Amino acid sequence: PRXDPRXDPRXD
Ligand code: NA
């Protein structure tokens, strides 16, 4: 989720 983690931060 690096960067903007809004929404669904699953994964990176
Ligand atoms: Na995401």
Side-chain angles (χ1 to χ4, degrees):
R2 72 186 76 201
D4 192 310
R6 83 181 72 190
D8 194 319
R10 288 177 282 191
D12 191 322

